[model samples]
Target chain A: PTMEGPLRRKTLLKEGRKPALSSWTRYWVVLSGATLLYYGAKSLRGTDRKHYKSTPGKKVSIVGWMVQLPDDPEHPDIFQLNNPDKGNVYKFQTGSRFHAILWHKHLDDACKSSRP
Target chain B: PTMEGPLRRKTLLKEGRKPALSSWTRYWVVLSGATLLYYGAKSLRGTDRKHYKSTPGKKVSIVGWMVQLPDDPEHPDIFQLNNPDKGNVYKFQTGSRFHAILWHKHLDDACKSSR
Candidate 1:
């Protein structure tokens, strides 16, 4: 299972979100066993595969509105996370509700397993 | 009395400072039981009648330079914190060595206590 060890692995699990306060951008969510790996592009079809994780544990917190999308069906299915350890909040929009749930589920489980 | 529970208390500990990649900004630090509470001004004097805790636990991390100031005391006493769960990192500057120590000491202690 991918949850067994701390091996560096990256999987393109569709795309992801980044909150810009005024606007939000999308990314091809590079799911590594490490951080919430991601990078920029438009419409999920652009030449941008450069991954970066300057620090690990940039996470989708269990203390967030996971699985809750925006009201407008046209708007993206967004969720929120916080870095209380460093005083930061983030908004994210996943491709689907199921995808959002899956991401949060694993991240929450991983966080539980990894917390000290 | 304050630390017993989540009471919204604000303390203007000192004329605190902030980090600019180019130039710095000064703020009268309004320390609250909630967040690393702060606001903007110059020389700690200006018309900023606001105290905001947009979120709580935006911290001066036990992870970064808690006491290590810049080589230039002429520069500032600076430290960094990260919102790992949110991928946000912040930098802050303090007024004096003692102030920095006091701030981090309590914050680190608080972090430990709450955790």
Candidate 2:
């Protein structure tokens, strides 16, 4: 279930055809952003938490799997977006204005070294 | 556009022959705060569906106007923000945060009642 990102991107291509334009590329961070807002707003409407939703010191956790870790076989083969210590990464993705969720180390590593 | 609010502060100052000091100002925001060890470190981010946008339940409506109106000739025009179900508004300029599609109202009958 660990669909490699490129492969996942390829698989989601319409009719298996890569988008003619790259802008059409989908990003998890943006989608997750939307989801997080949904819940946050939900909380606001009395549709969510009874207390606070936008207060400071917010925590988030998630598992993101660019690679599947056999060491933690418990994680699904698909994607890992949450982390135990952070808060909720699945609810909030990368490229977000705020950075709290610790990312998968590999992605961190990739970022440290620019890819050609 | 009856930009009234204290005559919009004569702020359209200038690059020419007028007053000397301006400190340069841009009203409408502070952009920071502090709180819980339960750290709201990060939060929801989203983009438009079929587009660059992103939402939730609670409801909101606007009722503000520094009274840019000359009685009832109709609104001359201007700007106003929104009503959030909660406190945090600008840092998420209806932008980048868990976003969405996108209000206005009687806007302060306070001219009559409250103020």
Candidate 3:
């Protein structure tokens, strides 16, 4: 059309992000520095996003007992996961919106009855 | 430490892990295989532990409106961070122990009107 501006459909009218830092020099420098600083440091994980998503993708089993009423009475509840080490047992209330991925790490004496 | 049998603390009767997979072989094969499988998979993060811990260690902001009574009324009562996008406005109550590290991503529009 006569009134159209040059390059009526230009490429600049779009969303963008800054170019990623790809220079090998800076990239390697940052990588080396971080590695050096954290080389021997150990850390305890507070919680991992996929903490429940185990690798090896194998089935894991835990031994425990549960005794608690579901927030709603209709749900079939099972053993309440307990942990003496952490001083807290878990409750599963399928009602009242109380649902979480429940898993536990077993102790060495997990199956020995009264024999540590 | 006299009566301790067999070099007592000899570095063996303990816990451990198998030596990890090491440099360049099936390592790269497995790595490249996994990478290829996940290359274009989009993931909407389903709750990162540090999701509350935003990166850049910078500041963020959000807007909406709040309107709810405190579950317990001893709190400073701030605006309930609401969002129609997610269909949930937040609630805050100092007494009820409702606290969140609330930082929002600014929607491109607001403040144009509320400003």
Candidate 4:
């Protein structure tokens, strides 16, 4: 079978990204090969390679939101996903606080069982 | 014919938008009803209304890029269009300095002669 051992493929996690300092927009994210591949639209689906962006295993780290100096009120159920390699820290929010917890937990699990 | 005075129904302008502190991406903008309707994909063309975003006539105002305290260095050929109603101020960039001036001029013309 395609799904066996410590390797899993085609896991999807959908959420809205309210970047560090920008608009709130939806994203279609998939975890594959220890990387999070995200697309602006679900239907994008590799239609155009240039339009999609990803975070590789080496630079992927998730942390709690609201650690900045002033703190943000608009996004309480949010978390920060850092890709320091690109100097970009993406702020993401799931459907609820519990979902945020699960998302990060799974991401942590993926990193622990697979990556360094 | 579909021609008329001070009433251009369909016009498309393309540019890249670099928000206050975010990634730079392409957009297809159309000025109609005194509003700037932007789509992430050129082929989007009203295919999905929910996927597109817009700047209404009332909330559309263009200003030179640098007015904030710490002038942004990444975007010089850029300007800001405010949508105060939504509290969203979008920082947009043109391909060149000349294009920015031309876009603002055309927007000004549309506002003057029409809305």
Model 1: how far residue B78 lies from native, Å: 51
User: What class would a CAPRI assessor give candidate 4's docking?
Assistant: incorrect
Once superposed on the true structure, which residue ranges of model 4 sit more than 4 Å away at CA?
A1-21, A42-74, A84-86, A113-116, B1-115
lDDT on C-alpha atoms for all candidate structures? 0.36, 0.22, 0.20, 0.38
lDDT of 2 at A70: 28
Q: Model 2 over residues B1-115: C-alpha lDDT tens digits?
A: 1000000112222333344543322111111211001111112321211112122112222232132222221222222322223222221112211111110112333212331
Give every candidate's TM-score on chain A: 0.48, 0.19, 0.20, 0.46
Clashes of 1: 1
On residues A39-87, what C-alpha lDDT tens digit does candidate 4 reach at each position? 4532333222222344322322322222121134554345555442434
Point out the worst 10-residue segment of candidate 3 chain B by lDDT. Answer: B1-10
Categorize the docking of model 1: incorrect
Give per-residue CA lDDT, model 3, range B11-93, as digits (tens): 11112322243121110000111111101112323112222221222121333332333333444322233433534333322
Q: Could you tell me every candidate's TM-score relative to the true structure?
A: 0.29, 0.17, 0.17, 0.28
Error of 2 at B31 (Å): 2.3
lDDT of prediction 4: 0.38
Q: Sort by lDDT, best first.
A: 4, 1, 2, 3
Query: Among all windows of ten consecutive residues in candidate 4 chain A, which has the lowest summed lDDT?
Result: A1-10
